[PDB]
């Protein structure tokens, strides 16, 4: 019987089944609940929307994310979403499948407990598991041996792997991501006059971000360019018309992944904390680490941003080692594609954690052994 | 307003008081209890100790 | 040489002499002009009329703010008002007196590149400088941290500083104040029968608000209290006899800064805005963040308010802090008195932004270096 | 004249007179820059702060040790904590006082040497002189002849005396010591849902290690008993509110000096390295060696250390030798008191290295002779 992979992610869901080469449905993590009257008697009015019907309607709802920074701080939010994906979008039976879930690297050990608790009675899957989503997106680079930097909406995190084994202690987690770079793009806007406050205006901005930002090469000459001259605006159409013109911001915005200070952070740039969970690592495996990083997850998939990357790293490499980014193309759902080869092997098939298992166990299983 | 305001968040300051106060006495008798656990514990050892040192010089 | 100080806000200008007590010139930032026809050969009739002159003509005019939500949305009214402001209220040359002109946080940066193009061009001030309302605030106060709540006419923002030192992360910016209130109080009152639809009624119906309006300490038990009996009734007689009687709109029209949602917006209220700028804020400083609230602006002046704000944050915040919300008597020109003082400074005289700066540079002096 | 006494260290400067009975002044090793904008004028903004000055304002600082691992990594920064030292601590003048310097053992050359020169030109010392922890720390037990394990902030080293002989070649460093253990706690409690990553947090967590953390006599069934029952937990009240509760970690963090895998290291335990450190040395000398294990630093002040190493040691020694640790109360000082004894012994008087003798050698006259 087929599995099921449902990498969930703190801004989309990206579900499937286990052997495809993509995932079969790709709706955004939200859940959305109506905010205004209601006067026409008889409309049928839902008490909640999930998913793009949520996001259709977003003019009239306010729409709240599930999961803030990897962790799910919702469950009954997270219940409906789920609940939708396997019913509506995937439209199956979750008690005829195995499901894959997907963890980020570091996070609170009750995620998981409810995780499994909640697979298991209220939905009764024959078994799950719960991967790592660095392992899955090397799995999908082809690979056994590199340093990942998987970067969604929620979490980046370093996971550097040596012949498939891992160094759980050169894991290294930050916490700004795609949302944060919203805020701050959200705030920086309002020095031109545009002001979006609503969280359906946080959208609108999300989709400019995913639209008109790049990442500079040298930050300074072009901060000096877009001063010079004007021919780095470009323009943008809300969904009333008024467009809207934005200049440095297009750099301003994920620039902010290189110097978190922008944002109020302390911590380092994911370059340098690239090149931190590098050298935190054995002196002979990270000749062949600084040749392998892989690019993952969306806000990865910046133009501009690889090239940066690679300046970075060999600026802070030894000058005789190769740094080579990899980013491929498709590398949004990297996570997911490993997701499904995982799900696929027939070495795999005695990882699972059965209903049984649980029943003897508890919920406490999930990491206790798996 | 205020006045009530205080009076009841202050009363249920007494209340969280007899409750820590009860913890306090409570922690005091596990102090006594296990002075006196102790005590037994170092009579057993010297005790022990004794037999030890007196048994090894038979050995 | 003295300065002059020159606090603009969105509803009420407040001139003065830097070194005074208290602003010498407060009026109406307002510029009417007549509608009707004009009959009397010879009368002299002005082309518009500005300040507390366009108040006593009031029946005869439309009003028009040139500031709306902190913004100077008309240049041709701002000139004239400041014209006004230097050559009749406070009777003075500009071309002899640097000025202090302040401004809200987070607002585009054309308006202050246009604040210093118009004093240094049409009015040959020496020098000028435009500070943040919050940080004159704090100077009035007499502290170096703590978290300030300013709510005049057009803006409500908290900015937390702690030992001089601005959290530009952590800044907050509401755009609901004084006006929205009074157009949400000018809305409520059509249903006891009162029609306020004039720009000069809306005149009126802020009188009302400043007179009679107080904030609710528990808005639920308040609201059935008013349903029991009619001793919350008060009386207010317009200026034409014809007196009015309101009940629970009273405390109705402030209760919107505490539940936004009154007038359609989906912001929290600005207990919940100030806790989260203070849970935004390092760990180590908020306990000292949480003792020092200061209020300011006239929308601060409700009776009530600060009994209501610290019931709410400590409801919110954990119930070991000391939440102490610190509101003067005066705490309504608190901006000006802090900026007096600043201006005053011996220190300061080195941050002026001289004539030669701005002959060098641009209008974009301002904001590049100071 | 009086000598000084500045036993380093990397987490914590220790400074009195010889001659005295404890250190005069104990401050951290630290030192801080602001990271925020500085908004108030005429605050009087330092460039850097020192000491326990940058403890109190951390909260809007960036805390740097110039300390790494026992090796002095950044000299202006150490200049400064010197400077510190002497002018605000002890307030003192250098020009008239020889300085009794510490060191540990098996750490680079040029870390004496510009140790020795700092002080003979920047602070103009007349004399001056280097020794090693372990040898100061067996001064203060009052004994010559042990092998001590001392373990401070930086690093951890054993050194086998034997009647005032030192056994260089069975000295054994190693390089986990508290800040390890700050850093492993800091990753281990973010499995309950803590988050600390500024270095502000960094000394938070490093005061909740001070405080709730012991070494179990037996590490599984105190595991086993840990998850049976939850009489293990206490909890900590941040400095803001928000009581935590810990668990196993309170045990888990220094459990790992005896199994350094923990935190990905090859080494072994502090025991096993101090019974192979014993093993070293010549066959007669070590059983008075098992008897005279003295303990010093910081580091081994968590409860129950002294027994869980004498079960260990005892397991790993011959049946028939008389394991003895000897942990005093104040063995955190421990370096710091046998440096004042030996700086007060008369017959130490011809060991300082003079003026004179540096102006004639260089600074290499440090290590080629004293
Ligand atoms: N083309 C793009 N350019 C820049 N950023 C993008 C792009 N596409 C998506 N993003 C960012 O990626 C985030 C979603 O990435 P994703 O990997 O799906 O997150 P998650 O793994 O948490 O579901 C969004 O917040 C968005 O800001
Ligand atoms: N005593 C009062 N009670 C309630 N509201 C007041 C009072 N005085 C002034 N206001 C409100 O304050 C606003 C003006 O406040 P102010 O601080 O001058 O704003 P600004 O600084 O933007 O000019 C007016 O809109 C008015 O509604
Ligand atoms: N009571 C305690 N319990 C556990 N650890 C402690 C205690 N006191 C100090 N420490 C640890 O000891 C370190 C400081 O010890 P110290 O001997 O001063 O080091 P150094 O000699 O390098 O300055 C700190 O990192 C702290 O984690």
Same mark, same amino acid.
């Given at each position: 019987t087929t599995a099921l992979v449902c990498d969930n992610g703190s801004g989309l869901v990206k579900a499937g089944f286990a052997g495809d080469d993509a995932p079969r449905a790709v709706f955004p993590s939200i859940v959305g609940r109506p905010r205004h009257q209601g006067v026409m008697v008889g409309m049928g009015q839902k008490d909640s929307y999930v998913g793009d019907e949520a996001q259709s309607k977003r003019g009239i709802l306010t729409l709240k994310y599930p999961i803030e920074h990897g962790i799910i701080t919702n469950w009954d939010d997270m219940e409906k979403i789920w609940h939708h994906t396997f019913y509506n979008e995937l439209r199956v039976a979750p008690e005829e499948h195995p499901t894959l879930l997907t963890e980020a690297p570091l996070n609170p050990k009750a995620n998981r407990e409810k995780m499994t608790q909640i697979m298991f009675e209220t939905f009764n899957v024959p078994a799950m598991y719960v991967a790592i989503q660095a392992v899955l997106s090397l799995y999908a680079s082809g690979r056994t041996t590199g340093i990942v930097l998987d970067?969604?909406?929620?979490?980046?995190?370093?996971?550097? !792997? #040596? $012949?498939?084994?891992?160094?759980?202690?050169? !894991?290294? +987690?930050?916490?700004?991501?795609?949302?944060?770079?919203?805020?701050?793009?959200?705030?920086?806007?309002? $020095?031109?006059?545009?002001?979006?406050?609503?969280? @359906? $205006?946080?959208?609108?901005?999300?989709?400019?971000? %995913?639209?008109?930002? #790049?990442? @500079?090469?040298?930050?300074?000459?072009?901060?000096?360019?877009?001063?010079?001259?004007?021919?780095? $605006?470009?323009?943008?159409?809300?969904?009333?018309?008024?467009?809207?013109? !934005?200049?440095? %911001? +297009?750099? +301003?915005?994920? %620039?902010?992944?290189?110097?978190?200070?922008?944002?109020? &952070?302390?911590?380092?740039?994911?370059? %340098?904390?690239? #090149?931190?969970?590098?050298?935190?690592?054995?002196?002979?495996?990270?000749?062949?680490? #600084?040749?392998?990083?892989?690019?993952?997850?969306?806000?990865? &998939?910046?133009?501009?941003?690889?090239?940066?990357?690679?300046?970075?790293i060999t600026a802070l490499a030894p000058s005789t080692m190769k740094i080579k980014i990899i980013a491929p193309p498709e590398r949004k759902y990297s996570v997911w594609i490993g997701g499904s080869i995982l799900a696929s092997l027939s070495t795999f098939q005695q990882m699972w954690i059965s209903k049984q298992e649980y029943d003897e166990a508890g919920p406490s299983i999930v990491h206790r052994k798996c | 307003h205020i006045a009530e305001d205080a009076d009841r968040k202050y009363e249920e300051v007494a209340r969280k008081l007899v409750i820590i106060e009860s913890d306090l006495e409570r922690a005091e008798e596990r102090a006594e209890l296990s002075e006196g656990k102790c005590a037994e514990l170092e009579e057993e050892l010297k005790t022990v100790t004794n037999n030890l040192k007196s048994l090894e010089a038979q050995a």
């Amino acid at each position: 019987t087929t599995a099921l992979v449902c990498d969930n992610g703190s801004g989309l869901v990206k579900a499937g089944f286990a052997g495809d080469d993509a995932p079969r449905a790709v709706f955004p993590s939200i859940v959305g609940r109506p905010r205004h009257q209601g006067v026409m008697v008889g409309m049928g009015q839902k008490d909640s929307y999930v998913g793009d019907e949520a996001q259709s309607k977003r003019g009239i709802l306010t729409l709240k994310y599930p999961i803030e920074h990897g962790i799910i701080t919702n469950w009954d939010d997270m219940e409906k979403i789920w609940h939708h994906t396997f019913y509506n979008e995937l439209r199956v039976a979750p008690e005829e499948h195995p499901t894959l879930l997907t963890e980020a690297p570091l996070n609170p050990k009750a995620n998981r407990e409810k995780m499994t608790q909640i697979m298991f009675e209220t939905f009764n899957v024959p078994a799950m598991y719960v991967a790592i989503q660095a392992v899955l997106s090397l799995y999908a680079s082809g690979r056994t041996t590199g340093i990942v930097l998987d970067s969604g909406d929620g979490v980046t995190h370093n996971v550097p !792997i #040596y $012949e498939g084994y891992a160094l759980p202690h050169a !894991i290294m +987690r930050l916490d700004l991501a795609g949302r944060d770079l919203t805020d701050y793009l959200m705030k920086i806007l309002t $020095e031109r006059g545009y002001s979006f406050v609503t969280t @359906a $205006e946080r959208e609108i901005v999300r989709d400019i971000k %995913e639209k008109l930002c #790049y990442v @500079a090469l040298d930050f300074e000459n072009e901060m000096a360019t877009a001063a010079s001259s004007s021919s780095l $605006e470009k323009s943008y159409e809300l969904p009333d018309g008024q467009v809207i013109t !934005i200049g440095n %911001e +297009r750099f +301003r915005c994920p %620039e902010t992944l290189f110097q978190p200070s922008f944002i109020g &952070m302390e911590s380092a740039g994911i370059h %340098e904390t690239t #090149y931190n969970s590098i050298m935190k690592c054995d002196i002979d495996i990270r000749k062949d680490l #600084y040749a392998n990083n892989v690019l993952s997850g969306g806000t990865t &998939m910046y133009p501009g941003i690889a090239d940066r990357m690679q300046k970075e790293i060999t600026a802070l490499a030894p000058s005789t080692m190769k740094i080579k980014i990899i980013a491929p193309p498709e590398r949004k759902y990297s996570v997911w594609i490993g997701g499904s080869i995982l799900a696929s092997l027939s070495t795999f098939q005695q990882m699972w954690i059965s209903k049984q298992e649980y029943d003897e166990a508890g919920p406490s299983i999930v990491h206790r052994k798996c | 307003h205020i006045a009530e305001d205080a009076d009841r968040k202050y009363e249920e300051v007494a209340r969280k008081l007899v409750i820590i106060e009860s913890d306090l006495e409570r922690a005091e008798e596990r102090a006594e209890l296990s002075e006196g656990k102790c005590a037994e514990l170092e009579e057993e050892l010297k005790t022990v100790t004794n037999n030890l040192k007196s048994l090894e010089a038979q050995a």
